[PDB]
């Protein structure tokens, strides 16, 4: 199927406490594989997936140099943005950057993203044409003009379409045993009576990978649902994910409800009901 290489960079200024904090994380699909944190005397890019230890010192030295340089650029960018918005040096501000590429089933470039956010809001985005920009205000229009002056969109295309695609293929090969292994969800239904007249049916999906999943409570048209709840997909902590969906139904109608679970790791969708 499709695969993605994505980097997430955060820089947060610290008034009167030195240089901004800078944290970079890299993901292949839903698996984090690298991290850089500048809160160290000699900060290093480090592996966060064991299969990345197949990479030699040349790789880590190069990524460490890139991440250290990127942190400096973001410190400059925070100073520039503060001036664009006439903001004082006493406030903490956040600059975020997400970038990467998506491969199609053919292994070819499918889509790329390059997006900046300032204080939690879109700031400057490279459009899907990989040649025009979206600036959100007059400040971002200055940044857009500077990127156009420097032909940044063409340098982005070269990375997103070639460098990014080439290295995503390499990472997928180095970690194929885990990255390409689909782990289906383990599913069950639990029953929790609320009162004498109503009960909660909770449909569980545990230990699946990747994170994309659909949990749906279906009913036969004769069910009278009192309430529903679907929690955000959450990490189990071991590389897999969890999710559940609940419905509050009148006691005695439990058998009118069926939980439907769809996940790439299942050969076919699973249907569960509450059986004491």
């Amino acid at each position: 199927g499709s695969h993605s290489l994505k980097y997430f960079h955060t820089s947060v200024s610290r008034p009167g406490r030195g240089e901004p904090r800078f944290i970079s994380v890299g993901y292949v699909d839903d698996t984090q594989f690298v991290r850089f944190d500048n809160d160290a005397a000699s900060p290093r890019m480090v592996p966060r997936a064991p299969w990345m230890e197949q990479e030699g010192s040349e790789y880590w030295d190069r990524e460490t140099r890139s991440a250290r340089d990127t942190a400096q650029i973001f410190r400059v960018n925070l100073r520039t943005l503060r001036g664009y918005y006439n903001q004082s040096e006493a406030g903490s501000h956040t600059l975020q950057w997400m970038h990467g590429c998506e491969l199609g089933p053919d292994g070819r470039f499918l889509r790329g993203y390059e997006q900046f956010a300032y204080d939690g809001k879109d700031y400057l985005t490279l459009n899907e044409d990989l040649r025009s920009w979206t600036a959100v205000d007059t400040a971002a229009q200055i940044s857009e003009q500077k990127s156009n002056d420097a032909s940044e969109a063409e340098h982005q295309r070269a990375y997103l379409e070639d460098t990014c695609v080439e290295w995503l293929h390499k990472y997928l090969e180095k970690g194929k045993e885990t990255l390409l292994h689909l782990e289906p969800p383990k599913t069950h239904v639990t029953h929790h009576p609320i009162s004498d007249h109503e009960a909660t049916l909770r449909c569980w999906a545990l230990g699946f990978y990747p994170a994309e999943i659909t949990l749906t409570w279906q009913q036969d048209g004769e069910g009278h649902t009192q309430d529903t709840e679907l929690v955000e997909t959450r990490p189990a902590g071991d590389g897999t994910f969890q999710k559940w969906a609940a419905v509050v139904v009148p006691s005695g109608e439990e058998q009118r409800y069926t939980c439907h679970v769809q996940h790439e790791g299942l050969p076919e969708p699973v249907t569960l009901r509450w059986k004491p």
Binding site: Y7, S24, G26, Y59, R62, E63, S66, A67, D69, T70, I73, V76, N77, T80, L81, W97, H99, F116, Y123, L124, S143, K146, S147, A150, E152, H155, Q156, Y159, T163, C164, W167
Partner: peptide, 9 residues
Amino acid sequence: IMYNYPAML
């Protein structure tokens, strides 16, 4: 790998 030198804002 990371991209080198995002153009300054």
